[PDB]
């Protein structure tokens, strides 16, 4: 297995991965076989790490996870588009705080009901550099740590709500953390 501690993307055991933090040395990601990885973090800053695909799309993804946050963290499908510049999250579980934004509707899919939100992020890290951009959210109403995500059902609900996606960059089943400690192990597949 490979331990990642510096911002990078690449491929491991057939799958794209991405690691990003603004607090190097406080978080690591261990790449396991197939679509599997773990993370460990301690009094960190911001971090996002996961395996998935370098070009996102309307995939039906199945994941199985162990998720043990001590504070603010998400277990979430995460990705980016350009033209327009958008980041999006399908949040399956969280730690101390359930994320919210401007309410936009609800979508029911894969046995659960999700609230839909939009937020704006100002002068923040993006795939293009420091930029201002929209975040699209589907947040499950009840936490879960395994199951299937029919991503097309979220994209379509967002579009019905006036939330328009662009050309896809990467798409990962991510662990994301903010000023917390914890661990995770996440195993994905299309």
Q: Is 35 left (phi over 0), alpha (psi -120 to 50) or beta?
A: alpha
Instruction: Report the candidate in 56, 81, 61, 88 with the shortest Cα–Cα distance to residue 176.
Output: 88
- How was this entry determined? X-ray
Q: How many residues make up the chain in this entry? A: 190
Instruction: Report the candidate in 112, 52, 56, 62 with the shortest Cα–Cα distance to residue 86.
Output: 56
Instruction: Report the candidate in 49, 39, 65, 58 with the shortest Cα–Cα distance to residue 15.
Output: 49
CATH of domain 2-189: 2.60.120.180
- Burial level of 46, CB count in 10 A (0-12/13-18/19+)? middle
Give the chain as a 3 state SS string.
CEEECCCEEEEECCEEEEEEECCCCCEEEEECCCCEEEEEECCCCEEEEEEEECCCCCCEEEEEEEEEEECCEEEEEEEEEECCCEEEEEEEEECCCCCCCEEEEEEEECCEEEEEEEEEEEEEEECCEEEEEEEEEEEECCCCCEEEEEHHHHHHHHHHCCCCCCEEEEEEEEEEEECCEEEEEEEEEC
In the chain, what are the domain boundaries? Answer: 2-189
For 52, residues 6+ apart whose C-beta sits below 8 A from its C-beta are 15, 16, 17, 18, 61, 77, 79, 170, 171, 172, 173, 174, 188
Question: What resolution in angstroms, rounded to 1 decimal?
Answer: 1.6
Rounded CA separation 163/156 (Å): 9
Instruction: Count the Cβ atoms, other than its own, within 10 Å of residue 30.
Output: 15
């Amino acid at each position: 297995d490979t331990t990642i501690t510096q911002n990078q993307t690449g491929y491991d055991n057939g799958y794209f991965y991405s690691f990003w933090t603004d607090a190097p040395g406080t978080v690591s990601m261990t790449l396991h076989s197939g679509g599997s990885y773990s993370t460990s973090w301690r009094n960190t800053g911001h971090f996002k790490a996961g395996k998935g695909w370098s070009t996102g799309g309307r995939r039906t993804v199945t994941y199985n996870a162990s998720f043990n946050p001590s504070g603010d963290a998400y277990l979430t499908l995460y990705g980016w588009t350009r033209n327009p510049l958008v980041s999006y999250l399908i949040v399956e579980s969280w730690g101390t705080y359930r994320p919210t934004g401007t309410y936009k509707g609800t979508v029911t899919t894969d046995g659960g009901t999700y609230d839909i939100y939009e937020t704006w992020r100002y002068n923040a890290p993006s795939i293009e550099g420091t930029r201002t951009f929209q975040i699209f959210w589907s947040v499950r109403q009840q936490k879960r740590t395994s199951g299937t995500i029919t991503i097309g059902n979220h994209f379509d609900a967002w579009a019905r709500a006036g939330m328009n996606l662009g050309s896809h960059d990467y798409q990962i089943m991510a662990t994301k953390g903010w000023q917390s400690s914890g661990s995770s192990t996440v195993s994905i597949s299309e």
